[PDB]
Design a protein around this ligand. Structure first.
Ligand SMILES: O=C(c1ccc(-c2ccc(Br)cc2)o1)N(Cc1ccccn1)c1ccc(N2CCNCC2)cc1
Ligand SMILES: O=C(c1ccc(-c2ccc(Br)cc2)o1)N(Cc1ccccn1)c1ccc(N2CCNCC2)cc1
Ligand SMILES: O=C(c1ccc(-c2ccc(Br)cc2)o1)N(Cc1ccccn1)c1ccc(N2CCNCC2)cc1
Ligand SMILES: O=C(c1ccc(-c2ccc(Br)cc2)o1)N(Cc1ccccn1)c1ccc(N2CCNCC2)cc1
Ligand SMILES: O=C(c1ccc(-c2ccc(Br)cc2)o1)N(Cc1ccccn1)c1ccc(N2CCNCC2)cc1
Ligand SMILES: O=C(c1ccc(-c2ccc(Br)cc2)o1)N(Cc1ccccn1)c1ccc(N2CCNCC2)cc1
Ligand SMILES: Cc1ccc(-c2ccc3c(ccc4sc5c(c43)NC[C@@H](C)NC5=O)n2)cn1
Ligand SMILES: Cc1ccc(-c2ccc3c(ccc4sc5c(c43)NC[C@@H](C)NC5=O)n2)cn1
Ligand SMILES: Cc1ccc(-c2ccc3c(ccc4sc5c(c43)NC[C@@H](C)NC5=O)n2)cn1
Ligand SMILES: Cc1ccc(-c2ccc3c(ccc4sc5c(c43)NC[C@@H](C)NC5=O)n2)cn1
Ligand SMILES: Cc1ccc(-c2ccc3c(ccc4sc5c(c43)NC[C@@H](C)NC5=O)n2)cn1
Ligand SMILES: Cc1ccc(-c2ccc3c(ccc4sc5c(c43)NC[C@@H](C)NC5=O)n2)cn1
Ligand SMILES: [Cl-]
Ligand SMILES: [Cl-]
Ligand SMILES: [Cl-]
Ligand SMILES: [Cl-]
Ligand SMILES: [Cl-]
Ligand SMILES: [Cl-]
Lengths: 277, 280, 276, 276, 279, 276
């Protein structure tokens, strides 16, 4: 169900005319740091992402804007094109997400990890952001708990997808019978986002990832070949009481062949995900 | 024919629904999009909305229509919006309403009767004013046909306006006084197809039927294609008996199969038969 | 002992020497209109498709000829190469299919729709035409009710696939060579399988799995529902429908063409072989 | 208007099975000599053009065949593809044109030349062959007295266009589509119109509008006179010649091909129309 | 119009100062170089010298001009020298002197009075003779204007001569009697721009002002440009009232915006209004 | 030298005549367009308008001028409009007025008298401030000359400002990275350094270091004297001129651009800094 949304109007006035820009770093993005800023008129707190103008920065702003129209993606308040040291730069003003990352909520749990009902609620809210992106032909390509931020510390807080630094747009017949591959032959794979959901889901349940380096390295040749081969297990200490329904859902998202992988529509209609209502 | 400084196109980014109430009543069907009926939320005034999915062809239609819009004989653009729908950008052209019906309708209403040389000269002058403006700003409409010329109102003082820039195309070291046109701006003869269309419309106004058609009611047939390529048409005596040598020769010059042999819009607008209905 | 079919012999004499060509339009094809003609000697009625000679017309005639050798594809009687208006043209003489299209038989049923046994018999006869094409490396690419015509109005009438206007040709130790090593294919046959899934859905309920909500021919919503695989089996009509046929439809309506069911798997499915 | 014509069926049997091929040369074409042959069964005399098979020979046969369907172009009886010295060759069997070339009837008249009435009739029959070719998108490109032969010596003989050695195909909202939008011309039919202007001039006085002053075949002066459009109507011969035909010639001898008269305009000109 | 055997161009290599006295008095300014006043050392006679730096464009101007020089209506080249000056090769074109002033001066001197149809047809006929020669030898001048047409002397029997081949371009890269022009030589450039220039000069001769100009006295304006492309000009009634429809139709045919619709030089030279100059 | 956050260029689309009264009084002539006198309709304030037809070179002038405009030594851009005229897009640059005259007018008014080392260093320092800004933001003006340096007012507190970006061009471990590794230069800023050397020479004596002996605009001799580096400091005028400024001129008039002095070295030279 889609509606008529407004287009992006890039403001050209200096951002300092409207906002007080502090040097408090709220976070670090793929293509730029996120600073804490304040509206000069309302005194309201906002987050500012600073990108040097270039084709990759123009893509991030453009794709984030189209996605922003969804309650599960971090809202863009304004976008400014300003000059600094004779170089153009894009300044994205976004809403504040003070509830912390999903990475933090995961670390705070530790070895305790989450229940199948707690994990299905988290996965359903991540899946709502992915279903929106995929429905508007956008693959996030960097879905991880560090990029999913809570709006507030409250128990009614919304989990929001952020950082479109790696995002990519993924795009003579009778309408009723036209096959999907005939309509839009895919430029990029959304299926990499499905693999990320499988990785996050596995972590939510036991507290560790399905693939890692045995000696705590960031990446190792062994970790790479285990990913390529699909070499992972559900260790018995933590995975003992976990249902074979969620074990099979993870198996379908961690399929090494992207065309064998589960789609976002299938994931959002899975009983284990829909249990949350 | 004097030019002035006109404003550039400022595409509005706010959602069109903030300013207008968009109805689903289809006012007409364009080359690249349907025209719907909308209402200004503040003034309650009725407007027409053309919806195009953003792409290079849609950007061309909006850009060329805007430059042409600056003429009283082309449908006026009130505003242009760039909005999102289904995660895709789209251009929404708000235009004035043309409730007087198409010139095609006024043509079927006349049937076998057709129009007089004074009535046709009236109509052809107003189409020619729209074409003279486009050609003067290096734009070839490329789809000049009665289904695209609409009347502003049903009144007898209504203006005939050119619409739909779905096929429009832009057509573009010496002493200024003496420089030949081909030296200034070399063009690929896109404008001359608009001159051919005037010849076809002129022929239909004077007799009720077209110079070229398929004998067995087909939409297009190989025989009809060869008749256009060869320049095989006639002025059947029942209807063309009373028609002057002057307008028959004007039609012969617009229906020249060789585009370089065809009459220009300046020559057409200065032809005595077209100037006969000119209020000096 | 040695099973071989004859090649296509394009006749060059004027078609009017052998047939009386009427202007009664029997139907409208992708690349040409079908006319009603009569054999001058036998007075028998035939259908004539007229194509202007060109590479696309030569492809339609060539692929339809190879397919014609199957009882489930409209038979070609003769092919003529004649001149008209100084242009070469291919005139395909075919058998008459007076039983009406499957589109008509579907519309005539309306909300009543078809039983699981009636639909499986229709699907099995469509599948026989597709299995033949795929076995000779031809993808039809326009499989829809409008291109499936019945031979006669009788209850023993055969459903035949027509119009090869979008058809396209799709093309170590022998025992162990994998299919992708022998003939690497474009992935054009799988769109025919999607078409079977759509026609099967329409048969069991009377409406398609994907349509524009506001009756449009095509809408951005309809496009994204196809790409996402957004369809359901509404409970009023799909209440008593078996989960066997629901699973068959799910496998043909897989958005990923490589995940889709092959014609061989479809023809060996118990619900399709239920017919016998 | 146009009708359904038969296509070309190239015979593969040896031509000597059906005809006796004599060595009497009937004429010399652009790409081959025309020999005198006889039907073995009927003893009837025919003309045979021999071309070595190649793309240019295939073009001549193909374009001549499409044109042959007109009473003003030399009729093709049969076309054979045979082998000689291990090379394929096309043998075109045509009807005999024993009435002599238009070149001969011109030379035989000499200084006497033709009347405006006689020249109008000749020009109308040449124009009928050109109107057919141009209507089917073929430019002959070698229109000249030597290529226009009479069927017989009788006064009711038909003048026929021959030799497609230089002929070339000129191509790849309905009511309002301009000609240049339909078929943008690959070649110029315009040069055949220039040739009609030259022949018409020769018919009225006995000499051409452009020639080399020192009897040469071609000279730099003759070339610049053609490019400039430098010709006149000398008073002894063109004194009593009407300004109607002088204006017709001026319109066909326009140096700018797009300014030149079309075949439709030529065939509807009162001076040409007067014959019938 | 017949042609004869002319001698080729022999570029002299001796220093020009061996044969001529070169003064610094500038006689005029050309597209590619200034025209100086020189004197033949032996005969003491007055000559004009164009100095071009040697390069492919200069070699083209000399080559093209040389071919055209073999005509009484084009400024004659007396000699061409290839010398070294400032360590660079250069071409020095010695031409005859045209002391009668430019046609531009004769036009300015008349002012509002302009020229009669008899006077204008004599001027136009002499310009047309230079263009007919160039077009016959496949050369388009491409800068035909009153400033490039100079008179031989101040006398009333003076000949008008075409000068400056700075923009000139060569326009070229079956049965003889019947071969069409487009089959012989298909165009490399169009001569028809020269025909447009004749139409403009003819309009100025008959009335005193051009058919196309900038309304605010600018050298060139977007309005002037679109008036040219469109073919937007008129024959204002004060001046064009008594002007014949024969010469107005001649101007209309030369100012056709479509070059293929435009009149050829042969048609122009055989037009009764142009031929009237010799009854 | 510190940089700050500046606003980007917002090209206005409304007709300029809605906000300004455009007069035909020509204030000056630029590289790509004439500068006219205009008045703000609301404030009645006087402004300068440069009119350029939209094209890549015009878009470059506006874009580079805008980035440079952020410096007090470059003519300020008030607004930029994109309007239509004769169906063609055009860029209308509204700038502040510089009514104090060009540096050129000041140099001509001095004549043979010339300027002392102290006032010539003051002029050079203010030109160098505009060049230091451009070079710091990777822009080479490429047309630095007294005609393009205008005074804001006739007052004694007037600022000398650089104008006309008609020839301007963009020229593009942290502690240890060499400049050539960071930004390898696309064009050359060093031609602006040569221009400062020429202007400095003129200020001190009244004539340029390179000129045509026979008063020509440009001559082959003048060209080879520039390429060779053939100039001198004639004794009448350059007798009491310091060897410090003679050496500064020698370093800016180095024929090899890589041997030439940078803007940072020029701005830190004692003779330039003497002004304070
Ligand atoms: O990288 C990880 C790792 C553990 C938890 C997480 C983790 C990663 C992202 C998120 Br968001 C949230 C958790 O990553 N490794 C590999 C490794 C090897 C050697 C030294 C360091 N690290 C890992 C470490 C310990 C375990 N176990 C100890 C507790 N009992 C069960 C198994 C499993 C994997
Ligand atoms: O299509 C047309 C047609 C007639 C009028 C118009 C027409 C088209 C667009 C506009 Br906007 C306005 C009129 O089109 N045909 C061909 C055709 C033939 C058979 C069946 C359907 N159509 C046509 C019909 C009759 C004639 N006549 C012959 C001469 N005597 C008068 C009648 C001419 C053309
Ligand atoms: O287009 C179709 C349509 C219905 C049936 C078919 C159809 C198509 C091909 C064949 Br072969 C045979 C049937 O198409 N629409 C959309 C539409 C909406 C508005 C106006 C026109 N069209 C449609 C309409 C109603 C339903 N409902 C039926 C009862 N349950 C709830 C949904 C479903 C689809
Ligand atoms: O070529 C021809 C020529 C004459 C007749 C024909 C001719 C050509 C094709 C056909 Br099919 C039928 C006749 O061609 N020349 C040139 C030429 C010049 C000198 C020597 C040989 N040839 C020619 C000869 C005489 C005249 N004159 C006739 C009387 N008035 C003065 C001019 C004109 C042209
Ligand atoms: O440029 C010219 C021009 C007039 C005459 C000539 C001229 C040019 C080349 C030659 Br070689 C010989 C004469 O040029 N302009 C334009 C212009 C407009 C405004 C200010 C400056 N210039 C001009 C044109 C027409 C008129 N008139 C209108 C019609 N009635 C008579 C007066 C006046 C001036
Ligand atoms: O062009 C110049 C010139 C002198 C001053 C300027 C000048 C240039 C730019 C600015 Br901003 C401001 C002044 O230009 N010439 C050559 C020239 C010669 C003849 C006629 C025109 N031009 C020049 C003239 C005289 C001298 N001198 C030699 C040394 N003793 C004093 C006189 C030097 C050069
Ligand atoms: C009190 C308080 C605490 C935290 C925050 C907060 C922190 C980070 C972001 C944010 C809003 C948007 C975005 S976007 C983005 C971000 C952030 N952080 C880095 C990564 C995930 N990438 C990105 O693009 N709000 C606000 N207020
Ligand atoms: C009461 C009432 C009756 C009719 C109309 C009316 C109908 C169609 C259009 C129109 C205004 C602009 C345009 S533009 C355009 C159009 C139309 N129609 C289809 C085709 C010709 N193409 C186009 O671009 N106004 C409005 N109100
Ligand atoms: C009495 C009677 C009633 C109907 C028919 C009848 C109608 C359509 C076709 C047909 C035979 C072959 C083909 S082929 C073909 C066709 C048809 N129709 C259009 C589309 C589907 N495309 C095609 O290629 N027979 C014959 N006789
Ligand atoms: C008694 C008798 C005398 C002459 C002829 C005769 C001579 C030439 C041709 C001909 C028939 C066809 C063609 S075709 C063709 C031809 C000829 N001649 C040469 C050139 C013009 N080129 C061609 O293609 N018949 C027949 N019978
Ligand atoms: C007393 C007196 C007054 C004038 C002249 C005089 C002036 C200019 C030229 C000339 C001879 C040849 C050429 S050629 C040429 C020229 C000239 N001028 C500039 C332009 C038109 N371009 C050129 O190439 N004679 C001679 N003597
Ligand atoms: C009363 C009064 C007197 C003078 C002026 C005045 C003169 C020239 C310019 C100017 C403002 C900007 C620019 S920009 C520019 C200019 C000028 N002049 C030509 C050259 C240097 N190039 C350029 O780009 N103001 C204004 N008001
Ligand atoms: Cl490891
Ligand atoms: Cl027809
Ligand atoms: Cl919908
Ligand atoms: Cl000769
Ligand atoms: Cl103007
Ligand atoms: Cl010098």
């Amino acid at each position: 169900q889609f509606h008529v949304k407004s287009g992006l109007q890039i403001k050209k006035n200096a951002i300092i005319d409207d906002y007080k820009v502090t040097s408090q770093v709220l976070g670090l993005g793929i293509n730029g740091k996120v600073l804490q800023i304040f509206n000069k008129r309302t005194q309201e707190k906002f987050a500012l992402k600073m990108l040097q103008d270039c084709p990759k920065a123009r893509r991030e702003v453009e794709l984030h804007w189209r996605a922003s129209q969804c309650p599960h993606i971090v809202r863009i308040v304004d976008v400014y094109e300003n000059l600094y040291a004779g170089r153009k730069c894009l300044l994205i003003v976004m809403e504040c997400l003070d509830g912390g990352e999903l990475f933090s909520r995961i670390q705070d749990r530790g070895d305790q990890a989450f229940t199948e009902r707690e994990a299905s609620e988290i996965m359903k809210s991540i899946g709502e952001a992915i279903q929106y992106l995929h429905s508007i032909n956008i693959a996030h390509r960097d879905v991880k708990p560090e990029n999913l931020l809570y709006t507030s510390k409250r128990p009614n807080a919304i989990l929001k997808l952020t950082d479109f630094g790696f995002a990519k747009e993924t795009t003579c017949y009778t309408p009723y019978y036209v096959a999907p591959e005939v309509l839009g032959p895919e430029k990029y794979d959304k299926s990499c986002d499905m693999w990320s959901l499988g990785v996050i889901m596995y972590i939510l349940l036991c507290g560790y990832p399905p693939f890692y380096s045995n000696h705590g390295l960031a990446i190792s040749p062994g970790m790479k070949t285990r990913i390529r081969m699909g070499q992972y297990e559900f260790p018995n200490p933590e995975w003992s009481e976990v249902s074979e329904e969620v074990k099979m859902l993870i198996r379908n998202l961690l399929k090494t062949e992207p065309t064998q992988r589960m789609t976002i529509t299938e994931f959002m209609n899975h009983p284990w995900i829909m249990q949350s209502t």
